[PDB]
Amino acid sequence: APSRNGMILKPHFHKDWQRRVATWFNQPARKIRRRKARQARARRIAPRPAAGPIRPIVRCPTVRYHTKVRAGRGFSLEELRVAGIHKKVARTIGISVDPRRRNKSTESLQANVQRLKEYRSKLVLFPRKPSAPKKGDSSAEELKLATQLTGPVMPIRN
Amino acid sequence: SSHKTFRIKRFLAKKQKQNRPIPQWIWMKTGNKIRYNSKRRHWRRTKLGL
Amino acid sequence: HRSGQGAFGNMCRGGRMFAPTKTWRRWHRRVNTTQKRYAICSALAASALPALVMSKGHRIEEVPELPLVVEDKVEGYKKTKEAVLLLKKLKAWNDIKKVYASQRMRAGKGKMRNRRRIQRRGPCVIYNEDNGIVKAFRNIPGITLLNVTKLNILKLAPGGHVGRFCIWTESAFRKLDDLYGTWRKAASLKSNYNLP
Amino acid sequence: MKFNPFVTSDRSKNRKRHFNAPSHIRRKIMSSPLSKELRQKYNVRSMPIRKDDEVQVVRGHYKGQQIGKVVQVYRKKYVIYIERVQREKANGTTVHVGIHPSKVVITRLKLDKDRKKILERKAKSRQVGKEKGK
Amino acid sequence: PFHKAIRRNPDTQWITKPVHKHREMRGLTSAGRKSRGLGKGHKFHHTIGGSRRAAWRRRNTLQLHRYR
Amino acid sequence: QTQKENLRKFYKGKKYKPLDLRPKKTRAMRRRLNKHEESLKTKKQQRKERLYPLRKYAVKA
Amino acid sequence: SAKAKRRNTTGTGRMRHLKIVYRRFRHGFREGTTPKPK
RNA sequence: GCCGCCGCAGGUGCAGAUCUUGGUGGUAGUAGCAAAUAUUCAAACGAGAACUUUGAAGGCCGAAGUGGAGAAGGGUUCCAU
RNA sequence: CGUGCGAAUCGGUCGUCCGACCUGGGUAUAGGGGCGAAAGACUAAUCGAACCAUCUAGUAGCUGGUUCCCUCCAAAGUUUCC
RNA sequence: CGCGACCUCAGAUCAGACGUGGCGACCCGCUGAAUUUAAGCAUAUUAGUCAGCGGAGGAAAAGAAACUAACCAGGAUUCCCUCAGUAACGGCGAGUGAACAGGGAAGAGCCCAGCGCCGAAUCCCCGCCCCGCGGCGGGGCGCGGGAAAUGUGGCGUACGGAAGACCCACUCCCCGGCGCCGGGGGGCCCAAGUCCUUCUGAUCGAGGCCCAGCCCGUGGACGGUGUGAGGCCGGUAGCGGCCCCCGGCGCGCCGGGCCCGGGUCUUCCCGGAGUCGGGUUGCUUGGGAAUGCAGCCCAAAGCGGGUGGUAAACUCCAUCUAAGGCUAAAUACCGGCACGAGACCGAUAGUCAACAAGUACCGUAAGGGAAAGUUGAAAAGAACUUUGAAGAGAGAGUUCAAGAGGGCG
C-alpha cells in the first residue's frame, strides 16, 4: 500500500546484508591504541620531534580549491640545488626528499628556500658519540636547550 | 560367524569386561552421584550396533 | 524421546525466541553540545535552594551557614583519621552515618550478577590538584572526589534527583569565576559561551 | 579499594575457586587465629592447622575451655575432628563431630624447623609492614 | 630453496621466506599479474585498495556508527 | 638417563650426530636460515651504511 | 555437512602433542635445559 | 528475602490457533487371554504345586518328523552354586 | 482375519515338473541415469524421476490463530483504470 | 676391432637436504546454478552468490609511475568521512551503480638484464689440527677434485652514470664474546572486637562501647565461616617486603673483515618483444563509436610509443616511459592459547547438551539425535521389641523441627 506524495528512493537491502556486518565496536579502543603507539614512538625517538621532517609549501590544483596551501611530500631537486646542501647528506638529518615533484613556481621555490634556511637556523646537530664530540657539531649549551617540540614544527598559516 | 576373527574377537573380549556393573565400594565414599551402571548391554536387548 | 516433536517456533520448546536481540540496535543517543552546556549549568543554584537537599534526604542541620568552601590545606591531609577528624570538626558525620546505616539488600536478579551490595550516595567533594587527597579518601565510601572543570551530569543528579551537596575548595571557588564569569562577559578559558 | 584489573571480582568465580582447589591450596585455606597472649608474643596474626596441634572450641553448641587434639584432617569438606568432641550413635558407638577450623583458638603449636621458618617469615613481613607505615 | 649456494646469498633470502611459498600457485608472478589486468590510470578503478575482492568487499558493505 | 648423558657426552665433540639428539621444535623455527646467514649483509648495503648512517638531530623552540 | 564438522573435532581426541606445544609456547621454546639443583 | 515512591527500559497482560511439551479422566474392569487332537493319578524338597520333579497308564509327530548335525547370522546365549 | 500370527498370512483350490526349470556364493551396470520377454513396470515398508544436508525463514492476490481495563467520536460493499 | 672427450638420455638401501596430510575464524588465485524480483516471463536483478580446488602467513593482499590532471598544480601504498546514491548503466522499466577534490592514523627506499673498466681478479662441498657452537661460526693447510667464460666480484639503474683534468679537507663502518650500569615472567607472606547484656539452631542477630561520639585504613573490592561479618580466615592497598631467571638500553677491553669523499670544464653511453597495437567472438564492470582480461590471425615503431572518457583525417602542446623485481606502517578474526566485564537467560529458559552429552539410541549409508538439579548445618541413614518365610506394618532413638524417612527444598 504505497502512500501519498513524497520522496522516492532505491533501498539497497535486497541482498543478504546480515552476512556482511561491520559496525564500529572499537572506536575508543582504536583511539587508545593509536595514542599508545604515538606515545611509544615519541619515547622511541628522544631528540626528534613528533612531526619529524618539515613539509614544503604546495600550491593547489582544482580551481574550486586553488586558493589553498597544502603540505606535500617533500622538497624538490631544484630546491635542494638552490639550497646547496647535498641530498644524501640532507636525508641523514631527517629531511623529506623526493625527486619526482615538479617545479613551476618561482615564488614557492623562494618560499621553500626560505623554509630550508629557517630549518638550517633552527637546526641543532648532535655528536656521533656523547663521550667525544666531532668537527661538525654545535655548542654544549644548545645540546641542553634542545628538547622535544610538542606539535607540528613551523606550521603553515594563511 | 562360526569362523571367528582376531580383532573383533578382542573387541568382544573388551565388551565382556565392560559388561560387568559397578562395585559396592564406589558408593561408600563421599562423592556418589552414580546410582547404578547406565551404560549396560544385554545380548537379547542390544544387538551391539553393527 | 525426541520423535516428531516440532521444536521450531516461539510457542514450542526452544528452537527460537520471538524478536531476537540486535547488535546493530541504536543503543547510544547523541547529545548536542549546547544541551550539555545547560546540563552542566543549573546545578549550584539548586545545590545551595536548600529545600532540594531536604527533599533528597541529607542532614542539612549540621552545617550552620556556608555553601561549604574549606581552605586549601584539605588536599594536604593523607590520613583517614585526619579525614574523620575534619568531618567531626565540620560536624558533617550524620550524612555518612546514614550511609553506614542504610545497608539494605537488592531485590531482583542483580544479586547473582555482581550487583549485590548497595548503599546510599553521599555528598560530593571537588578538588583542584592532587596532593595525596585521593590516597586518603579512596577507602571511605560515599564521598566521591571530582575535578573542577571536568564534571558529570550523572554525578550531579544521581537518578534524576537534583539536590546532592557538593563541597568546594578555595581554589575551585576562585576558579569558577575565571571559568564562567558573568552574563555579559564570555568565558576566558573556553572559546565562547554566554550565560542565558 | 582495588585498582588492578587482573584481580577476580566475580561471585561465581570466587565460589568456584573456594571449593575447587588442590590439596596444597586447601591446606593454606584451612587456618586458625591465635590466642591473645600468643598473638602478642609471636606477633603473628594467623597460622595454618595441623593434626598435631591442639584445638579449643570457640563458638557453637559444644563450646568451652577443653584442649582437644585433632584426630584427622579431612580437606574435602575443610574439616577436622577434635578428640573430646563426639556424640553417641544409637547402636552404641561414638562418632566424632566435625568442627570448622575458623572457630579455633590456638593454645599450643607443634614447633618444627619448617614451622619456625613460617613464623620468622610472617614476623619479618609484619615488621616491614609496620616500619613502612610508622 | 634448500641448496646452500642459494641459501648463503643475501639477494635470494626473500625468495626462501615461508611467506612467499607457492607464488606460482596463487599467481603473483608476471603472468599471474598480466592474466588479471591491472596498472595505473583513470580507467583502472577496480584494483584500488588491496585487490578486486577487497575493493568489492569495501563497496558492498555498510557502516553503522555508535551514536548514529 | 646415565646412558643418554654418556652418549651425548661422547657425540658432543663430533660434528655429525643422529636425528634424535638434534633439538625438536616447531616447523617455522626449524626451517630457517643460520644466525650468521641472517647477519650476511650485501656489499652495497654495507657501503651505504658506511657512507650515510642516520644522524642524531633536533630543532630549537 | 555442518554436523559432520562438530562430530569429529580436534578437541575430542588426545591433543597429547598439541597441549605440550602450547605448554612450550607459554614458556618460550627453551631447548633441553636443566633446572638449578640444590 | 521483599514492598512503596521519582524518572527510564522490556523477551511485560492468553481461551482457543486439527497451537507445543507434560500430567490426568468418561470409556472400563469393556473387548480379549480360540491357526496346528490329549492328557490322567501316587509321592516329593518347599509355608505354598492346573503348569516343576520322578514312578505308572493312555497318545501324537510316522524316516520328505515335533529326529540328529552343519553354513550365513547371533557372541557366552554351554555348565556349576 | 481384516485395531491379524502378518505395515499383504492361511483353507478349498491349481499352471508347470528333463527343459525357454528354480537357484547357493564372488563380480559388472546408480538417478534426467541404470535395469527392463515392455507393465512409467522395479530400484532397501519410498519410484510419472531414490535417500540426506545446504540455498531456505524459496514463493503464496490463500486459508488457521493472534493476550489488561475505562471514556469519547464514529464507516463502505460505490466514479474511473489495468 | 682396439685408445682417450663434447652433447642427449639413464638406476639407487650412494653422503645430506625437501613435498605428501588432519585442521584452518581472516586472506590469495579460478570455476561459480536456481529458487526468487520484474504481482506472468526470456532481456535485466538476485549474482563473481552458496558450494568445489589448490595454498602459506599472524597477517595475506599491498607498494615507488608508460599516475590524478587542464589547475597559480601536485608525486609510493593503505583505512575512515563528506562527495551523493552523484554521473551513468538498464524490456532507459523494475533495479544496478565509482573516483578525481579536501582533512586525519602514515612515512623507507630502491635494486637487477643490457651499457662498459679491470689477469673467473668467482665461490661451494670434503679431510687434518686449533680455538667451540641445544641456529658447527671463522681462519691455517690442501697441483684433492668439481662448477662457472653459454659470464662471475665491485663500480651500476632513468632523479643520469662513468672516465680524464682542476681546487677543497675528513678519519670511522658494522659484527662476535667478557665485565659494569636500573623492564618482564614464575612464586612466597604482611592491620584493626570474636569487648559486655540478651535471643534461639549457632550467631554473621538487637542495644551500648564517654568527654575517644570502641579500633586501623596508600586495607570497608570479593568469597566462605550452624541465620544477612571491615575488624574469624583466604586476600584486598603498595613506583611496598623476600627468592630465581632472561633480554633490552649507556661505558671500557681486545678480536674479525675495513681506507672507499664534496664542487667546475670536456668526451663516450643509454634501455627490458611475438610484447603492445589492429580485425573477429565471449566474460565482466557504472564505464556507456569497447574499463579490463581471454580463444584465432597479423604484428611493429625507436624527436619512438601508451593516454588525453565520441569514431575517423590535418596539427600544436601536457604526462611519464608497461613488456624485470623486493619492501614493515594504519586493515580483518566467528577456531585455539590466558583473562576481565555485562540494564543478557535462569532447569521444557540459557550452547542440543549446568550431571560418566554428539553421550545413550536409530538407520545397510551418506546421516539424524534425546530425557535428566535442589535430603538434613551436620548421616546424627533408624540400634531395641513384636507380627510375618521374607516382603510389608506397630511402638522407640536422633535433631530446632521427620511438619526433612535412602527418587528424602
Curated annotation (Swiss-Prot), chain D:
Gene3D superfamilies cross-referenced by the UniProt entry: 2.30.30.30
PTM remark: Ufmylated by UFL1 in response to endoplasmic reticulum stress, promoting reticulophagy of endoplasmic reticulum sheets.
Subcellular localization, as worded in the UniProt entry: Cytoplasm
Region (Disordered) location: 1-21
GO biological process: translation
GO molecular function: RNA binding; structural constituent of ribosome
SMART domains according to UniProt: KOW
Entry-linked CDD domains: KOW_RPL26
Main localization of the protein described in the UniProt heading: cytoplasm
Classification via SUPFAM superfamilies: Translation proteins SH3-like domain
Protein keywords: Cytoplasm, Isopeptide bond, Phosphoprotein, Ribonucleoprotein, Ribosomal protein, Ubl conjugation
InterPro entries the UniProt entry points to: KOW (IPR005824), Rib_uL2_dom2 (IPR014722), Ribosomal_uL24_CS (IPR005825), Ribosomal_uL24_euk/arc (IPR005756), Ribosomal_uL24_KOW (IPR041988), Translation_prot_SH3-like_sf (IPR008991)
UniProt keyword Ubl conjugation present: yes
Name of a matching Pfam family: KOW
GO CC aspect terms: cytoplasm; large ribosomal subunit
HAMAP family named in the record: Ribosomal_uL24_A (MF_01326_A)
Function comment: Component of the large ribosomal subunit. The ribosome is a large ribonucleoprotein complex responsible for the synthesis of proteins in the cell.
Recorded family membership: Belongs to the universal ribosomal protein uL24 family.
Complex formation: Component of the large ribosomal subunit. Interacts with DHX33.
Full protein name: Large ribosomal subunit protein uL24
Organism: Oryctolagus cuniculus
Gene that this polypeptide is encoded by: RPL26
From Swiss-Prot, chain E:
GO cellular-component term (any): cytosolic large ribosomal subunit
Keyword presence, Transferase: no
Basic residues bias spans: 33-46
Keyword DNA repair: no
Main location (coarse class): cytoplasm
Gene Ontology terms: biological process: cytoplasmic translation
Subcellular location: Cytoplasm
UniProt GO MF annotations: RNA binding; structural constituent of ribosome
Stretch list, region Disordered: 29-50
Keywords: Cytoplasm, Isopeptide bond, Lipoprotein, Myristate, Phosphoprotein, Ribonucleoprotein, Ribosomal protein, Ubl conjugation
Family: Belongs to the eukaryotic ribosomal protein eL15 family.
Reported function: Component of the large ribosomal subunit. The ribosome is a large ribonucleoprotein complex responsible for the synthesis of proteins in the cell.
Assembly behavior: Component of the large ribosomal subunit. Interacts with IFIT1 (via TPR repeats 1-4).
Protein name: Large ribosomal subunit protein eL15
Organism, as annotated: Oryctolagus cuniculus
Covered range of the whole protein: 137 to 204 of 204
Swiss-Prot record, chain F:
Transmembrane intervals: none
Quaternary organization: Component of the large ribosomal subunit.
Segments for region (Disordered): 23-61
Name of the protein: Large ribosomal subunit protein uL29
Coiled coil spans: none
Family to which the UniProt record says this protein belongs: Belongs to the universal ribosomal protein uL29 family.
Domain of life: Eukaryota
Subcellular location: Cytoplasm
Biased composition (Basic residues): 24-34
Reported function: Component of the large ribosomal subunit. The ribosome is a large ribonucleoprotein complex responsible for the synthesis of proteins in the cell.
UniProtKB/Swiss-Prot annotation, chain G:
Coiled-coil portions: none
Gene Ontology biological process terms from the UniProt entry: positive regulation of signal transduction by p53 class mediator; translation
Protein location: Cytoplasm
Keyword Glycoprotein part of the UniProt annotation: no
This protein's GO CC annotations: cytosolic large ribosomal subunit; synapse
Keywords, alphabetical: Acetylation, Cytoplasm, Metal-binding, Phosphoprotein, Ribonucleoprotein, Ribosomal protein, RNA-binding, rRNA-binding, Zinc, Zinc-finger
Record keyword Repressor present: no
GO molecular function: MDM2/MDM4 family protein binding; rRNA binding; structural constituent of ribosome; ubiquitin ligase inhibitor activity; zinc ion binding
Assembly with partners or alone: Component of the large ribosomal subunit.
Family assignment from sequence similarity: Belongs to the eukaryotic ribosomal protein eL37 family.
Function according to Swiss-Prot or TrEMBL: Component of the large ribosomal subunit. The ribosome is a large ribonucleoprotein complex responsible for the synthesis of proteins in the cell.
Protein name, per record: Large ribosomal subunit protein eL37
UniProt source species: Oryctolagus cuniculus
Origin organism lineage: Eukaryota, Metazoa, Chordata, Craniata, Vertebrata
Gene: RPL37
